[PDB]
Design a binder for this molecule. Structure first.
Ligand SMILES: [Cl-]
Ligand SMILES: [Cl-]
Ligand SMILES: [Cl-]
Ligand SMILES: [Cl-]
Length: 424
């Protein structure tokens, strides 16, 4: 104990030690007029309650809570009726430290991870997932509706408002990719073997995505990348070495937007958010190329390699074509605040399926590993610290939730959606 609380005087929060720390850190807060009754003092760090261990008038000992990012240290004293009498806040902010960790968001298996059921259900009771192939948020849903195609397996819909994971009936045999048009309609690619059958389907936003339309025929279609200003759907077909497009506003087909140096393989195209260029992920050839967009002509330039070596799989971080990739699958652009004001404000996070990692390609062309291959192993199922502990097994799909500030990873051979976010 110490000096009794004086209701005439302000609470002053002078300083705290240590000045930084992680959740569970014992913090001593120093100042004036904290009183000598632990049950009557309240402490928050970054807005979150901190358990108070002792109070001695001019100091108190508390435990740093999780999620203390904002860092303001506020001390309040309440009366007998538990109403706040006084509060003070420190001028200095606590530097809350935290690691990013991999956790499991959706999917449950049984019999020591060998069996699962496939069903629509609540987040807590929705079986597990056969194939989390490519993910996409509905851009008009404010991060409340996440969808994924499953190739020959189920198409799923994660509904955050209702905390439900539905199965979408598509009547499409092999759903290879999903995107949304500028009008917000859902595009789904069917990878099928006839030149005279539909390869790109649309589900209309106006029907709540229940009404399906056929956009165009395409055999062996693999990807659907919607350009953010011109709205065209850019795609590849197995038997043709080129990028093609379909314009949903006019129905115009351009068979050869540009030649490619490879066919007969899976590709995934992702537009940079500016629309100035796209990456072409060579899923089967272990490299990523870039294709530039000329705004004046509306034409694509000759694609060029950015990282990896074509047909040379490996797990090697490094610069551009000195890096090695191994089954790069889906990637997404994520804003990096360290790049604020630079020509490129985005990093490119992608799942490297066969190295069992999430990797990053930076605008200079550097490839680094963000998560996976923990515990001195390659694949597995372990949650925890990104590089020292965590293990994936064929991570394939990826989405970034800007609202909740986390990644979702479709960890295909663990049959789960994994999350990468700050530890709580
Ligand atoms: Cl499923
Ligand atoms: Cl795209
Ligand atoms: Cl090249
Ligand atoms: Cl940018």
């Amino acid at each position: 104990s110490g000096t009794p609380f004086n209701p005439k005087e302000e609470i002053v929060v002078e300083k705290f030690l240590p000045t930084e720390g992680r959740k569970g850190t014992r913090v001593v807060v120093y100042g004036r007029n904290f009183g000598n009754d632990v049950s009557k003092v309240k402490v928050t760090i970054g807005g979150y309650p901190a358990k108070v261990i002792n109070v001695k008038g001019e100091s108190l000992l508390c435990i740093c809570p999780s999620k203390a990012y904002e860092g303001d240290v506020k001390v309040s004293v309440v009366g007998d009726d538990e109403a706040e009498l006084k509060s003070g806040v420190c001028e200095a902010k606590f530097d809350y430290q935290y690691n990013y960790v991999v956790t499991t968001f959706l999917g449950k298996l049984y019999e020591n991870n060998t069996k699962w059921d496939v069903l629509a259900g609540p987040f807590d009771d929705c079986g597990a997932f056969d194939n989390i192939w490519r993910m996409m948020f509905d851009p008009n849903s404010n991060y409340d509706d996440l969808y994924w195609v499953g190739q020959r397996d189920a198409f799923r819909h994660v509904d955050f408002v209702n905390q439900y994971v539905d199965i979408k009936t598509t009547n499409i045999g092999q759903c290879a990719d999903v995107n949304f048009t500028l009008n917000g309609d859902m595009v789904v690619v069917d990878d099928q073997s006839s030149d005279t059958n539909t390869g790109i389907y649309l589900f209309t936003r106006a029907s709540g995505f229940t009404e399906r339309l056929s956009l165009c025929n395409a055999r062996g279609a693999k990807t659907c990348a919607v350009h953010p200003q011109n709205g065209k759907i850019y795609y590849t077909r197995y038997h043709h070495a080129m990028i093609s497009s379909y314009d949903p506003a006019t129905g115009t087909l351009t068979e050869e937007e540009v030649m490619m140096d490879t066919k007969g393989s899976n590709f995934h195209i992702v537009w940079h958010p500016t629309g100035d260029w796209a990456y072409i992920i060579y899923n089967g050839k272990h490299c990523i190329y870039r294709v530039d967009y000329n705004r004046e002509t509306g034409k694509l330039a000759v694609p060029y390699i950015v990282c990896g070596q074509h047909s040379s799989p490996g797990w090697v971080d490094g610069m551009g074509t000195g890096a090695r990739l191994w089954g790069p699958n889906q990637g997404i652009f994520v804003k990096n605040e360290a790049y604020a004001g630079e020509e490129d404000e985005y990093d490119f996070y992608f799942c490297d399926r066969d190295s069992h990692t999430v990797r990053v390609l930076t605008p200079e062309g550097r490839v680094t590993t963000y998560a996976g291959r923990g515990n001195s192993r390659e694949w597995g199922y372990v949650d925890g610290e990104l590089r020292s502990q965590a293990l994936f097994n064929h991570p394939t799909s990826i989405a970034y939730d800007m609202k909740r500030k986390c990644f979702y990873i479709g960890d295909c051979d663990n049959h789960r959606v994994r999350k990468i976010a700050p530890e709580e």
